[PDB]
Amino acid sequence: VCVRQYDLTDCGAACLSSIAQYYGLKMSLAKIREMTGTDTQGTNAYGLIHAAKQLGFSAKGVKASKEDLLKDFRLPAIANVIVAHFVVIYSIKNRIITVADPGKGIVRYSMDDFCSIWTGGLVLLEPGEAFQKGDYTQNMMVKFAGFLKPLKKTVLCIFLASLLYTALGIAGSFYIKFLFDDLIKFEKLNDLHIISAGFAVIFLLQIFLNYYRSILVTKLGMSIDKSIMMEYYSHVLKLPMNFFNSRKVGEIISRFMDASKIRQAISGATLTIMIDTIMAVIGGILLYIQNSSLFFISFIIILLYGIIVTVFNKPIQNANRQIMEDNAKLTSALVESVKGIETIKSFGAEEQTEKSTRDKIETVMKSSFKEGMLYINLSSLTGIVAGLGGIVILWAGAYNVIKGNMSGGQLLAFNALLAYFLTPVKNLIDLQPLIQTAVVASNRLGEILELATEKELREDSDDFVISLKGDIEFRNVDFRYGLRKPVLKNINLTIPKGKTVAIVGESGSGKTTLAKLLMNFYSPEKGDILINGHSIKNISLELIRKKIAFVSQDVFIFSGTVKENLCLGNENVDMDEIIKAAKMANAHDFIEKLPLKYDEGQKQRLAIARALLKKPDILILDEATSNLDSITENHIKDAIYGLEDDVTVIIIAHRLSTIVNCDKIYLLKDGEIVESGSHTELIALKGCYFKMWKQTE
Amino acid sequence: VCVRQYDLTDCGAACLSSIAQYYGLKMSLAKIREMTGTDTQGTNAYGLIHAAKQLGFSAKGVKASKEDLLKDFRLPAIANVIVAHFVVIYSIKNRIITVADPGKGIVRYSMDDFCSIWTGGLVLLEPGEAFQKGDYTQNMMVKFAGFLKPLKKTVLCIFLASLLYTALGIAGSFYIKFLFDDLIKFEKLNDLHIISAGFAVIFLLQIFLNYYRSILVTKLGMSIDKSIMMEYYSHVLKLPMNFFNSRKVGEIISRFMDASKIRQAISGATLTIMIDTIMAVIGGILLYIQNSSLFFISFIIILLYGIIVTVFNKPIQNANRQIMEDNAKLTSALVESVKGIETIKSFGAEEQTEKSTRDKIETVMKSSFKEGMLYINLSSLTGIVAGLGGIVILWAGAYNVIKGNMSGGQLLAFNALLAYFLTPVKNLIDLQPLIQTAVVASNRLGEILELATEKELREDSDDFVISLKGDIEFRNVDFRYGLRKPVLKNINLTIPKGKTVAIVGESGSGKTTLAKLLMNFYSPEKGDILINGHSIKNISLELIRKKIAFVSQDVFIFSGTVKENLCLGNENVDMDEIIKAAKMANAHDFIEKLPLKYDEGQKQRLAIARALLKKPDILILDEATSNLDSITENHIKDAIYGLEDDVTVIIIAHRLSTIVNCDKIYLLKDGEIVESGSHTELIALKGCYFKMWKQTE
Numbered sequence A, B: 001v002c003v004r005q006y007d008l009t010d011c012g013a014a015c016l017s018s019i020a021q022y023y024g025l026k027m028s029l030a031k032i033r034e035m036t037g038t039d040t041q042g043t044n045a046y047g048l049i050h051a052a053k054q055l056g057f058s059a060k061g062v063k064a065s066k067e068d069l070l071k072d073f074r075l076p077a078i079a080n081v082i083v084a085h086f087v088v089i090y091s092i093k094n095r096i097i098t099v100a101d102p103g104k105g106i107v108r109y110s111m112d113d114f115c116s117i118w119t120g121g122l123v124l125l126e127p128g129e130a131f132q133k134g135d136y137t138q139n140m141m142v143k144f145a146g147f148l149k150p151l152k153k154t155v156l157c158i159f160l161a162s163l164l165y166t167a168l169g170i171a172g173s174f175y176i177k178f179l180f181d182d183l184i185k186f187e188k189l190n191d192l193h194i195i196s197a198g199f200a201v202i203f204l205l206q207i208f209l210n211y212y213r214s215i216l217v218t219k220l221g222m223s224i225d226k227s228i229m230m231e232y233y234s235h236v237l238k239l240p241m242n243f244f245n246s247r248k249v250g251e252i253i254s255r256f257m258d259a260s261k262i263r264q265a266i267s268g269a270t271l272t273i274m275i276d277t278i279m280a281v282i283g284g285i286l287l288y289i290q291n292s293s294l295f296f297i298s299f300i301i302i303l304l305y306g307i308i309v310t311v312f313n314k315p316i317q318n319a320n321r322q323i324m325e326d327n328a329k330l331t332s333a334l335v336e337s338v339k340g341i342e343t344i345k346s347f348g349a350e351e352q353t354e355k356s357t358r359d360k361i362e363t364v365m366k367s368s369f370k371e372g373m374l375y376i377n378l379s380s381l382t383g384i385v386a387g388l389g390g391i392v393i394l395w396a397g398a399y400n401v402i403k404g405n406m407s408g409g410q411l412l413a414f415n416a417l418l419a420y421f422l423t424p425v426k427n428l429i430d431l432q433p434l435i436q437t438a439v440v441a442s443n444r445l446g447e448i449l450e451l452a453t454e455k456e457l458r459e460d461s462d463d464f465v466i467s468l469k470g471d472i473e474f475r476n477v478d479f480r481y482g483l484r485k486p487v488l489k490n491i492n493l494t495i496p497k498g499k500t501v502a503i504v505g506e507s508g509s510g511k512t513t514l515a516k517l518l519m520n521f522y523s524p525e526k527g528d529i530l531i532n533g534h535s536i537k538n539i540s541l542e543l544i545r546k547k548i549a550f551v552s553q554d555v556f557i558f559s560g561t562v563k564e565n566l567c568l569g570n571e572n573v574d575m576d577e578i579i580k581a582a583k584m585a586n587a588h589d590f591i592e593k594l595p596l597k598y599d600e601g602q603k604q605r606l607a608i609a610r611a612l613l614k615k616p617d618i619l620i621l622d623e624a625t626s627n628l629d630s631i632t633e634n635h636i637k638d639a640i641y642g643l644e645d646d647v648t649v650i651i652i653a654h655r656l657s658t659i660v661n662c663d664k665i666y667l668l669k670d671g672e673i674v675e676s677g678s679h680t681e682l683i684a685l686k687g688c689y690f691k692m693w694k695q696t697e
Ligand SMILES: Nc1ncnc2c1ncn2[C@@H]1O[C@H](COP(=O)(O)OP(=O)(O)O)[C@@H](O)[C@H]1O
Pocket: A039, A245, A481, A484, A487, A505, A506, A507, A508, A509, A510, A511, A512, A513, A514
């Protein structure tokens, strides 16, 4: 078993899923990727072992060389290679090895190239006692096909239109039979004109029916695609924060074209399967009515066509993958050569780059020629089959007319019905490329939809609490981004109400993450956060996001009106508080100076303006005031100092001299606090804080 | 004139070129884009007026109002607009205006909407006395077709194959005529078998010829594509430095897809025009031999098909452009929403973003349904034409058979030849959305090809200058990045030969820019650079880059072997030189530790190792020792202090305390040196240097 990887960072998750499927436990790849703690850089070593231990495998890690591979080990094992890429071995045969990488699939390698590419790192697994076999996944194609239930009247008006269109086409095919058998032979003119007019009318009706059906199909496809995309986006916006920072932007954006492929499947394949099977049944019945031998020839033709189509469909996909890889490599080389043009030019080495790029463009050409050869061979074989079958059908029809089994224009009518019967069947046959990528996209999109949401991850919510008014107590708290190095170790503190507090430290100390946990982004793996005697996990999640304002060092303004920006989370406000906050946060003058009306420093002041407009109980500013001018600095200082309604205010800063006038100062050096107290006490109490104060002046 | 913009940042150049073409002066768009001084941020009014004045126009800039638009003045003018875009107005008629924008084309606007979008800035253009007209452009389709001149045996080996394929198909299309006219009527069996076998053999020969022709066509296309892309890349890697920093990477990479489109034009259109012309001439002659009225009916059918194809081809292109724009807007919205999820989650506004995304998705769906309706109308009209024409042809053939003008199977033979004649003409008609998208791509790719490179812009080389050792003189020099504000104003320096020099200053002063001018990158418009008594512009450019080493503020390392990255310029280097270069800048221990032996701090030390491997006359390094620790700092400092062979060394730093022991220290404060001298001499003379030293300690 070799499960194809969906992205470029889930190689280890794919390998672990393959091992689990081999051992009889099939589960969603998204759940495994979340369990391995995979980040944008991938799971280095520890994620696979931890996830296997959680799943019941007796995981272990060992560094082995070519000598260890000779003796023995368990057949399912993950081997680290350097081509964020892991490869799983399966067996050791006579001087050959087999590997099923997510990138390519089940392939075979020799020992020498293996040790050339396989890094000594090795992971061994073995199922434990708690390894109950099961199938913890759902057929996603059925789930997305369930979207057709509301659209059960547009589908019906499409099936009936298809039935009537095919009936009209079959009825109109017999024009050539009526021409030669009765009209031409007996020299009828008025009947000729009447019958020709009738068949023209039939064809016009056919065209109008096709127009109606195409309009309905387009509308249904658009509706289904929009529904799937909106569902995916609405579920994405609800996912926890550990889902976003562990994935790239493109990793989340690709699911829109995945949904487009899903629509291409459901709108097209589901309808055309029934349409083509019923039309093919009608066509085969009619062909058998006309003549049995010619129908058998047609059946042989279509069987050969299908066999050839699939047989050449597989390597065409392989060659397309190869040419895509080569084109990606060439584009990367071009990017590297263009974005570093300065050093290339200031060496006289332009001639070398031309040869280096030619050696890759030639590789791209030689990899495209393989796909061209496959396409040419497939087209030649299909053309041979179709043309020779048509010629043989004409031959057999002529022979049968000679023997008087049929009569003249019956052969031409059979040719028309042959086209009308072979086109639907070949359209049904050449659907495997569409349905395969459709299933791939459906699984890829439905993996995310099974992820737990923020609201349901909460254990419970309190009712009688209305505000976060209470001392902020921090017991022994531990936090680590995924399975990486720890950041929070033994941080213990107490923030009183209504008193401004400044936390100061250097870059990388773990202050922004502390603010993150302060407002329920991520969770502390150890300890608890107490507010007014109540834990942060036992209160309403939406309440925390409503009574806590947060302004970071990377603030931004969305591409929209300023009124929306200042009321991003609030929908019912009046302009009085908006104007007050604009004056309060030193932003009304900026907007008035700006053209029009209320319809990096500017972005920052807008950020504190909206944060204060939120009117919270806790107001957090991490690296915000340092990007303003001195006049704005002191204005913001005295403005945030004179805040009513007993609002707790926290400023995290990297410059000591910027903020001086708080009641209590916290300092964090290496994932922990060393000193805590007022600036007057901090100067008297000799410590690291005094050293940084001296070095900063 | 509304010539399309080939880049997203060259709108102003496009309007200027449109004005010039409307006034009778046509020239390449790349020449105007480099002439206007267009940058990555786009052009402004000053660039437009400067370029127009240099071209001979009496350009001017003025700010107008709504009432000014009502007044009569020079109608052809460029009007600024913020969506910062540029649109040229052509006429202001009675309560209506006419404009032409490169983004869309030529459109009309209303006074209210224009005044809402049009910025007050306005540029007026008028030809001067010396405005001799000209056409400084080449028909670049012919130049790219000239790539077929050496490959003329393959073309002659494809035309003959096409002729033989045509003859075989035409001969084999008479099988149905032979069946019904004589064979079926007279009840011949052995003759039937023989004739059918002969026609099957003819068809097999046709298939083999098609296979051979396809192979040849694929090979020809691959060769043409490779040659064109190689020529374009080799020309690009020679252009001056101002070309790369005035463009985006994608704006230089998309030319490869442009070359692919060019190949699709040359390989497909040029061959198929002749092939289908001969095929259609023969088919039409044969049809006229069979019957005249049916041939006229076929001609009318193909005329209707062509008319419909063009008439619906234009708005299909318009709708495709609109839907592409809507998709770009939607994906930008998704990216900006998903890369700023922190504030969205900590504001409670998950629902609002869903509403905005759904609105944009609905807009995209509507813009896609427009094109769907266009396609459906085109397909329905084409199907009506084809089917009704086939029915009419059958009707007319039956009537002719009744009237004794033709006979039976001749009508079926006419149908076969009718297909064989209509398919080529209806495939040549479908060539319209190939030539347009090929000519635009050819112009876009080939405007670059005529840009003058570094070598031709050089004034004159020298013969007796072999070494750059000597005094470096910087007379009063001016330097502006294109047409922006000046940076280099009055920098006059004297660097003694073989003496280490340190240059210090603030960020954005122009230290790296000065280093760039030193290596002949760009050119000072006023002033000169003197090397040991000789101007820099009088030396061969290959000599300067071969004798000056650069260590930039951000060295990049191209993927590959470290031996190749150290021998980037010279391909003939011994091992011991590499060893001593690695030992020259603390590189041997790091490289020997890596896998095998020789195949940010590490990369930058690698860059310095390469720099001393260049064994130059002048060695310039900026921000080269900052990332290394104090041990490596002092080691490299003592290593570079005691250099031999009279090597001039310039070290540019922003930290004053990093470098102390250079002979002379230069300070860059604001486009001017405030003092020059040794460390001890400059501190005694109170000034800027002492102030910054005291403020940094
Ligand atoms: N998305 C992430 N993935 C992995 N590690 C992270 C991520 N974000 C932050 N970290 C790590 O956690 C630490 C958090 O420190 P931070 O709070 O940013 O310090 P400061 O507040 O002084 O900037 C950083 O040192 C960083 O290495």
